[PDB]
Amino acid sequence: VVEVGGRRLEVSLPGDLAIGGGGGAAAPGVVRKKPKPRKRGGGGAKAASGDAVTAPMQGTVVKVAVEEGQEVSAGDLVVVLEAMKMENPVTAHKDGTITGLAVEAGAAITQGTVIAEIK
Amino acid sequence: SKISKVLVANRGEIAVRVIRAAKDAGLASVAVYAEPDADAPHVRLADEAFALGGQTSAESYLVFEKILDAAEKSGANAIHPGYGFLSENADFAQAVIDAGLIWIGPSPQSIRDLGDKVTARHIAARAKAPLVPGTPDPVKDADEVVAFAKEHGVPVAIKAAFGGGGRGMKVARTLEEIPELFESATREAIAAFGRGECFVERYLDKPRHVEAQVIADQHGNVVVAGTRDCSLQRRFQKLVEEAPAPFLTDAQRKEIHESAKRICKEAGYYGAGTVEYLVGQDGLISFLEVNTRLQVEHPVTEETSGIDLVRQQFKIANGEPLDITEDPTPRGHSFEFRINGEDAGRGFLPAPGPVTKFVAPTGPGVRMDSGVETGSVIGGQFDSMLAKLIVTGATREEALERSRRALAEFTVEGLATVIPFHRAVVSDPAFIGDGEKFDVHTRWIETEWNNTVEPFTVPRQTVVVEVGGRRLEVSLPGDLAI
Amino acid sequence: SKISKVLVANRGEIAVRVIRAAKDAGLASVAVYAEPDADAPHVRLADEAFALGGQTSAESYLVFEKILDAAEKSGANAIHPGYGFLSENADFAQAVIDAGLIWIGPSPQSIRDLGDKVTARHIAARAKAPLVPGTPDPVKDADEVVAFAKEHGVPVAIKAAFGGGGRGMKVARTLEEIPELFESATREAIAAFGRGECFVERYLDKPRHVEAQVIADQHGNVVVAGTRDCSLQRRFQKLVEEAPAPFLTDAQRKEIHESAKRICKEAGYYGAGTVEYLVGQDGLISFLEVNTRLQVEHPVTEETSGIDLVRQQFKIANGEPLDITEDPTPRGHSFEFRINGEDAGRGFLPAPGPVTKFVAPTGPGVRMDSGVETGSVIGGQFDSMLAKLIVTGATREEALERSRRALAEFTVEGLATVIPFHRAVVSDPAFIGDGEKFDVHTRWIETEWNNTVEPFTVPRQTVVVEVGGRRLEVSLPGDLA
Amino acid sequence: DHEAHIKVLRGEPTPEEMAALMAVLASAGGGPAEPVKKERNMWGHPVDKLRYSVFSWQRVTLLERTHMRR
Ligand SMILES: Nc1ncnc2c1ncn2[C@@H]1O[C@H](COP(=O)(O)OP(=O)(O)OP(=O)(O)O)[C@@H](O)[C@H]1O
Numbered sequence A: 001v002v003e004v005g006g007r008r009l010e011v012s013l014p015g016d017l018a019i020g021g022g023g024g025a026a027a028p029g030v031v032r033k034k035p036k037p038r039k040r041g042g043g044g045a046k047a048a049s050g051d052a053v054t055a056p057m058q059g060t061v062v063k064v065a066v067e068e069g070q071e072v073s074a075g076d077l078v079v080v081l082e083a084m085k086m087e088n089p090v091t092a093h094k095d096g097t098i099t100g101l102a103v104e105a106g107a108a109i110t111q112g113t114v115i116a117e118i119k
Numbered sequence B: 001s002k003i004s005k006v007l008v009a010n011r012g013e014i015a016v017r018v019i020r021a022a023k024d025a026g027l028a029s030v031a032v033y034a035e036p037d038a039d040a041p042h043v044r045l046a047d048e049a050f051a052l053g054g055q056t057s058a059e060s061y062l063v064f065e066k067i068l069d070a071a072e073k074s075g076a077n078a079i080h081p082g083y084g085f086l087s088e089n090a091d092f093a094q095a096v097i098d099a100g101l102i103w104i105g106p107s108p109q110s111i112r113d114l115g116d117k118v119t120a121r122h123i124a125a126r127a128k129a130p131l132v133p134g135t136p137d138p139v140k141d142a143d144e145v146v147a148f149a150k151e152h153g154v155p156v157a158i159k160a161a162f163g164g165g166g167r168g169m170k171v172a173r174t175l176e177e178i179p180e181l182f183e184s185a186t187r188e189a190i191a192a193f194g195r196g197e198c199f200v201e202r203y204l205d206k207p208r209h210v211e212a213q214v215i216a217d218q219h220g221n222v223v224v225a226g227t228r229d230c231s232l233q234r235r236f237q238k239l240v241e242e243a244p245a246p247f248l249t250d251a252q253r254k255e256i257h258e259s260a261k262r263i264c265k266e267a268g269y270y271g272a273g274t275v276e277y278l279v280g281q282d283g284l285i286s287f288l289e290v291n292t293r294l295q296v297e298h299p300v301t302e303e304t305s306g307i308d309l310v311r312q313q314f315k316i317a318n319g320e321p322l323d324i325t326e327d328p329t330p331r332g333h334s335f336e337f338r339i340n341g342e343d344a345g346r347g348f349l350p351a352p353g354p355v356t357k358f359v360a361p362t363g364p365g366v367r368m369d370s371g372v373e374t375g376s377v378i379g380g381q382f383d384s385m386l387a388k389l390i391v392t393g394a395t396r397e398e399a400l401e402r403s404r405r406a407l408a409e410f411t412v413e414g415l416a417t418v419i420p421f422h423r424a425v426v427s428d429p430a431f432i433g434d435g436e437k438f439d440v441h442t443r444w445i446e447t448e449w450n451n452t453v454e455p456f457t458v459p460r461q462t463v464v465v466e467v468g469g470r471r472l473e474v475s476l477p478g479d480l481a482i
Numbered sequence C: 001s002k003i004s005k006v007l008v009a010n011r012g013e014i015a016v017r018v019i020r021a022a023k024d025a026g027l028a029s030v031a032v033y034a035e036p037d038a039d040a041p042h043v044r045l046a047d048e049a050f051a052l053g054g055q056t057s058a059e060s061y062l063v064f065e066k067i068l069d070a071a072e073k074s075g076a077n078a079i080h081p082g083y084g085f086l087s088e089n090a091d092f093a094q095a096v097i098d099a100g101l102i103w104i105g106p107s108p109q110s111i112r113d114l115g116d117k118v119t120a121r122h123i124a125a126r127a128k129a130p131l132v133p134g135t136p137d138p139v140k141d142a143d144e145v146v147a148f149a150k151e152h153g154v155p156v157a158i159k160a161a162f163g164g165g166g167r168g169m170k171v172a173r174t175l176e177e178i179p180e181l182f183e184s185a186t187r188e189a190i191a192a193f194g195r196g197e198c199f200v201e202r203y204l205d206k207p208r209h210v211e212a213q214v215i216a217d218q219h220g221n222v223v224v225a226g227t228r229d230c231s232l233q234r235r236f237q238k239l240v241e242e243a244p245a246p247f248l249t250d251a252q253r254k255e256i257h258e259s260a261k262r263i264c265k266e267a268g269y270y271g272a273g274t275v276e277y278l279v280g281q282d283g284l285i286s287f288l289e290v291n292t293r294l295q296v297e298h299p300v301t302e303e304t305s306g307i308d309l310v311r312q313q314f315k316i317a318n319g320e321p322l323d324i325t326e327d328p329t330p331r332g333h334s335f336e337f338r339i340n341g342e343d344a345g346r347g348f349l350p351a352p353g354p355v356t357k358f359v360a361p362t363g364p365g366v367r368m369d370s371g372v373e374t375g376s377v378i379g380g381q382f383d384s385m386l387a388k389l390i391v392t393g394a395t396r397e398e399a400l401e402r403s404r405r406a407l408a409e410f411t412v413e414g415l416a417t418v419i420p421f422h423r424a425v426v427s428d429p430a431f432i433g434d435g436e437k438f439d440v441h442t443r444w445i446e447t448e449w450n451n452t453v454e455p456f457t458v459p460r461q462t463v464v465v466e467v468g469g470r471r472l473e474v475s476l477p478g479d480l481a
Numbered sequence D: 001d002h003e004a005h006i007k008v009l010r011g012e013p014t015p016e017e018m019a020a021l022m023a024v025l026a027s028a029g030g031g032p033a034e035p036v037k038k039e040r041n042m043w044g045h046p047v048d049k050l051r052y053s054v055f056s057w058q059r060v061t062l063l064e065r066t067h068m069r070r
C-alpha cells in the first residue's frame, strides 16, 4: 500500500522487477515458461490410449449400462455418474470387450477410478 | 449543481453506511482515514481514499482544511459528515460553502440556531413546543438557582447552555446541596465548553425518551418519517433503540408528529433531522432537543417506514422536492442494539483490544452495519462502538423472539462487548411489554436492571517530492524491498 | 468552436515562435518532440510536451496518427501547421477536421489549390497576374520540350510540380541540353515524391523575388499587410529578407497588391497567406507563388507592421471579422538573416555538431528567433537552421550598420555556422543600392561575393505499468538509483 | 508479450501522481544485486581444508564435485 499525494494506491511489484538498472531478477539463472495445466496431454487421448475406462470426476455410479463380457463400440454408454445431482454419461472410447467391470449401481466413485477395461 | 462525488468526512459504521448509500445512488465516494484506520473496511469500500495522517481525531478527522484539501484533491462535489466530528460545526459548513462544495446538511445558520441550547429553548418557545414550565436564561447565581427550585418545585435539573453528550447535565434533589453544584457545574461548563452558563428545569423522575425522525425539504415540505423509543440508556447514552415508540396513544403520537412538523417549519429546517421528546413517569409528554442530522439510529426507521434516509439526504441536498407527502406507516416492529467494546459486566468502561473473531448474525429479519471485521483492532481514541444489529418482525413479540435468536448467534471474541447485556435484557420481563406498558426508563440500566453479567476473563517510509507545480508527499511501507 | 489549447507540431524555431505566440495570447500550449529534442528549448518552454520518439525526423513527424494521438491525449483543441512537415498537406487538414480539432490554417481546398505551385500558375493566368508566360499548362513530353525550347527560345526552366525549396528545378542554356534536364527532373522528382508531374517555361536571367502578405476573413475582410524581398540567395534558397520590399516603385507595388486581391478572390481565399513575385533587375514583375504557410520570414513583417500575425491567425481561425482592414503603410526598413548550420569556410558544406556556445544579438533594432540554446546539439537529421537574426531601422542605411554590428556580435562556437557569411555579405557593396536601383541579383553571392572565412578545428528505459489492467507505458532515464 | 508488469491494483492516480510514484519506486529499486563480474576463485576453498580418509566417498561427492562444478 502506497500513498501518493495522500491518495491510497495498492501496488503489486514483481519479484523479478528490474527498473533503474537493477539486478537480482532470476538471480540463480531461473528459466520461466508457461506452466502446463494439471491434466493429461489431451491431444487425441488422455487415459483413452489404454484399455481402462476411468471416471472423469467424483460422483455416484447411478447407472451401469453394460455387463461383464459385453462387446461395445466407441461412443457407447458405459456408466452414468451422478455428481452435484447432475447426470454425466461416461462412454466407451474404443471398441472391444467389457472386461473387469469394477462397479455396481450406487457405488461412490472418484476421479480416475477405473470403471472397466475395454479389451 | 448535482452531486457526482461525495467525500465522507467520518469513519467506521456511518462511513460504511454512507459509502454504500452513495454506490446505491450511483455516486462516486471518497473515504478518509487516520493512522489507526488505514485498514478499516470503509477505506477499502470507497472508490477513492485519502490519508489524513496523524494518530488522533484532533490530528485527523477534526481539521477542516485537511478535509477540504481531500475534497480539492479528489474533486469531490459534495461533503457528507457522519455523526459527531464536524457534522454540527456551522463554521465548517461555512468553510465548505466558501469552497463552493455541496454541504450535505442544514445551512450554517439553520445549525447555529439550534447549536445554542438557550436559543434552542427560545426557538421551542417560538414554535410552541410541549415544554417544561421553567425556561431560565443562564442563571446568575446559586441563590437564583435555589429560587428557581423554590418556585417550580424540586426535583430540579441544572443544564449547561452549551455542549452535549450527557456532560453538562446535573440533578439536584434538595435545596441545601445546590450552591456547590452550581459552582462546580459552572466550572465543568468552562472546562469543557468555556462558557460558564447554565439554565434550570423541572426534572422528571423516571422518564421515557422518545424521538421524532424527520425528513425536511428545501422547498418547505416536511415529513415525519417515523417515531422511535430510545429510553434504554446508560449514563444518558443510547444502547438499545426501538421502533415504533412502543406505548403512546394516538392522541400523544399525533401531538408529537405535528409538534415535530411545527418545529421544523418554524426553524426553516431542511435535510434529515430528529426532534427529541420525553414522556414522564406520570405521562407528561414534553420536548427535549432537536438534533440537526441523520441520527445513527436511522436504520430502525428505515426498516419500519421503508425509506433510505441517506438517499433522502442526497435528494434534499440536490434540492429535489420530497416524493413522500403522506407520512409513512410502520409495517412491523424493530430493535437496534449498539455493539461496543465496553464491558457491561464491569460498569460499561471502555475495554479495547483486538477483534480476533467476528461472526456476525445473519438470516431472517436481521441487518448488520459494522465498522470492524475479524482481525480489526480498536483503541480509546474512537467511539469503541463496533456494530449495530437490527432485528425486525411483524410485532414486538416476534422481533423479541428474533432478537433472542440473533444476539445468541452474534459471536465476538478478543474484546469485551455489551452482547451479554443485550442477551440478558431481551430476556427481562421488565423489558418485555406487559401488553400496553413496559417499565424501562432513561435511568433503568443504572437504577433498575439486574446487571449480573460476570466479567471478561515498523514506521512507514516517507519522501517529499515536487512534480511540476504539485507538492506530493509519498509514503510507503518501511521495508519495501522492490 | 474556439481555440483553447494549441498544439504546434514542428521542430525548433517555428515551434518556439508560435508557442511564444500562444504564451503571449495566454493559450494553453502543448509540444511534441523526437529523441534529440527531448530537452529542446521548445519542450522546456511549452506548458505540456509529449514524445513522438524516434531518432530522426523521418521516423516520426510524418505519421498523422502519432500527431493526432498526442492531440487528443493532451486535449489540444487546436493544431497549428507552422512550416514544413504536415503544415501544407491536406491529408492532415482532413484528419484534423474529421477528428474535430481546429486546423489553424487555410481550408483543405485552399491548400489543395496551392500546394502544387502549378495550380497557382493556372489560377494566375486567369487572374491576369504577371506570368513568366511559358505555357500555363505543362507541355506533354520531351518532343514538345525541344519544340517549345526552339519556338520560345532557350534558356528554358524545367521544373517538377512540387519541386519547392529550390531543389526540384533546372535551367538550360542551349537547345541541345534540354531533353537531359527534362529526364533528370522527371526521374529525381519520381525519386523524391513518387509523382512525376513536371512543367517547362522560359527562364529569366535576372529576376528578383518579392512577396506580399495577405490576410482574409470568414466575414470577408481582406488586408495586404506588408511586403518582403528575398534577393540574397545561395545554393538557390531564401536566406535574407528585406522589408518593406525595397527598390520597387508604386508602379510595381500596384500590381503586386491588386493582382493579389484579384488572385485571392479568384481563389476564394480566406485566412492568411502571401503572394510571391520575381521582379527583374529592370523592375519587370513576373510570378512565382501564392503561399499559404506562415512564411518563416514573418519577423520583419511582425516588426514593421502592427500585428502578431499568428495572434491574428488565432482570430481568423476563431472566425472573427478582421480588426485589421486597412492596407497599411510599412515603416522604414528591416533585414532578417537565416542562421544556418553550414561552414562558410568550407564552401558552405553542411556542418553538424554540439552547440557548445551560442550567443545571439539583443538590444534596439535587433531581434532573434532563437530555436537552439547553449549546450544543445545540431545536425541534418532535422531542419538546417539554428536560429534567425532580424534587424530593423528607419531606412536601409541604419539597418545595414545595425546588421554589420549585429553579425559581428552574433557568436556561435563548437560547430561552423553561416553567421560569418552574413557578416561578409552585409559588408559586400552590391547589396547597397544607389537609391533607384541596386546591383544584387540571383547568383550574385556565388558569383561576386568576397569570401574570408577560415576552417574551424545512459539510454532511456521504458517500463509498463497497469492501472486496473489498463496499460500505461511509462519512461524514465536508464538510471534513477 | 509475457513480461510481469507493476500493477496499480487499486486507485486511479493522475499522471503527476503516477510520475511521483514511479520516480520514488525507480530510485528505491535495488542496484546491481548479483553482480555481473562474480569471478571464480577457488584458492583456499573450505573443502580443501578437510581431512579425508583415503577411501572417503566424499572425495567424489564433495571434493571433486566442488572443484569441477562450474
Ligand atoms: N436529559 C436527557 N435525556 C435524554 N437523553 C439525554 C439527556 N441529556 C443528554 N442526553 C443524551 O445526550 C445527548 C446530549 O447532547 P446533545 O443532545 O446536546 O448533542 P448530541 O446529539 O450528542 O450532539 P453531537 O452528535 O453533535 O455530539 C442527547 O443527544 C442524548 O443523546
Ligand SMILES: [Mg+2]
Binding pocket: B276, B289, B290, B291
Ligand atoms: Mg440531543
